[PDB]
Structure 1
Amino acid sequence: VETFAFQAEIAQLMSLIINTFYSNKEIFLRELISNSSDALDKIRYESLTDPSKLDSGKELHINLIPNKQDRTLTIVDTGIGMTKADLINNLGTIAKSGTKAFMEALQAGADISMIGQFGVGFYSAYLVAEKVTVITKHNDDEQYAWESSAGGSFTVRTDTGEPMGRGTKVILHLKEDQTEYLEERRIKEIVKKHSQFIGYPITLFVE
């Protein structure tokens, strides 16, 4: 297991997301589904000229898996996946510059829900999760697990879990007071509100 420090800017972003009073937490799901959609677009586009890139799985979809026993909401996609380097490099984001812009925007009247316009929507996971685990597999690399409970550091390790084939799994270990996001009615409502036109099937698993 390798432990890394977040860059100062990202640690600051995470602290802001965790400590700022902001009731409209449900946008985290929109942001994560948007990331999955982007990753699905990328593998789709690459497959247009090289169909072998789908040898690791032809289906392009998003699954939402609540588990009330474990208090986890998991978002699974079969998009392009991230390399180890991507994970370490802020989950494939322009986190330093994006955070800078987001901060200035918040002073220019913006609110936290606009975080995706600054390329760092992933971190909205911390609106509802005390810990986030990201398991990912890119065609050109091995399967890795990234994890962080904030507090300035994250870990990366080779994943020993179920082989994914290709794509990304985000496991949200929910805060005790955020269990509404495990309720079928609530998830359906949020997907319909914010993700109605996403171009991949979104399947909400039941328990």
Structure 2
Amino acid sequence: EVETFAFQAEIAQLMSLIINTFYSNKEIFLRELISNSSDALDKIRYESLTDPSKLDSGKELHINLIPNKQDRTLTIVDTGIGMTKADLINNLGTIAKSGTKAFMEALQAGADISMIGQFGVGFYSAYLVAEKVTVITKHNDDEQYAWESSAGGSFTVRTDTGEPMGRGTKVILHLKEDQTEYLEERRIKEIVKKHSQFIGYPITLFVEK
């Protein structure tokens, strides 16, 4: 059972700008998603200091980067706090509305796309490199869900029946045909070293076979 939702007009406008604007510095998408994963890990860590049982769904706090050339996907997995259904459908978009307005004001004031993460909408930089984004997520207080959007003004949410995750978020980037460099080990290593060198969680770059 798949539910289809419309993005808010302002968010759809931001995704169109990300997809259609000429901007060669696409590699910043990885910095932004790793930063989001680090924030999600900080949140479950801090919550567990006063309720240890919040880690019953998984004690390890980490980030995995998993490329797959056969599927042409780059997957960013974290074991952070995850997202509720209300997060996916309402709450993140409510924050993103004011951040988007602030970001697009900065952009016409001379700022550039790389600054997007300061406005809370860094997740959408995924569409610099991905034609479709699938997000699998599990919060301690909700079920496992799959969020998915190919932009174009709508996204879907369904209950996810696949491999149970325990807790956290998996972002699956279905890469555009001309962005397969982000499946190469040396390229991902370069980007992590350049932009994410001091993240306080183990980042494991998986190799393919």
Aligned structure 1 segments of 4 or more residues deviating by more than 3 angstroms = 90-93
**Cα offsets for 1:118-177 (capped at 9, x unmatched):** 000000000000000000000000000000000000000000111000000000000000
Q: Distance in 2 between matches of 1:103 and 1:180?
A: 29
Contact 1:82–1:92 (8 Å) recurs in 2: no
Shift of 1:89: 2.2
Q: Number of paired residues?
A: 207
The CA distance in 2 between the partners of 1:66 and 1:85, in whole Å, is: 29
Alpha-carbon distance in 2 for matches of 1:154, 1:3: 6
Identity of aligned residues (%): 100
1:28-47 paired onto structure 2 within 5 Å: 28-47=29-48
The CA deviation at 1:31 is 0.2
Give secondary structure in 1 for the equivalent of 2:94.
coil
- Three-state SS of the structure 2 residue aligned to 1:4 is strand
Over residues 83-130 of structure 1, what are the superposed CA-to-partner deviations in whole Å (9 max), with x where a residue is unaligned? 000011264661100000000000111000000010000000000000
Task: Identify if the C-alpha distance between structure 1 residues 161 and 61 changes in structure 2 by more than 3 Å, giving closer, same or farther.
Answer: same
| 2:75 matched residue in structure 1 | 74
**What is the SS of the residue equivalent to 1:12?**
helix
Deviation of 1:180 after TM superposition, in Å, equals 0.1
SS in 1 for 2:114: helix
**Unmatched runs of 5 consecutive residues or more in structure 2:** none
SS at match of 1:199: coil
* In structure 1, distance between residues paired with 2:163 and 2:207: 20
Distance 1:183 1:88 in 2: 33
Answer whether contact 1:93 1:119 (CA < 8 A) is retained: no
Extract unaligned runs of 5+ from structure 1. none
Per the TM alignment, residue 38 of structure 1 is displaced from its structure 2 partner at its CA by 0.3
The CA deviation string for residues 177-204 of structure 1, in whole angstroms up to 9 with x for no partner, is 0000000000000000000000000000
Q: Deviations over 1:20-55 (max 9, x none)?
A: 000000000000000000000000000001100000
8 Å contact kept, 1:93–1:120: no
Contact 1:65 1:74 in 2 (8 A): yes
Change (3 A) 1:74 1:8: same
Q: Hey, what's the Cα distance between the residues in 2 that align with 1:43 and 1:96?
A: 25
Partner of 2:24: 23
Instruction: Indicate the residue corresponding to 1:170 in structure 2.
Output: 171
Per the TM alignment, residue 4 of structure 1 is displaced from its structure 2 partner at its CA by 0.1
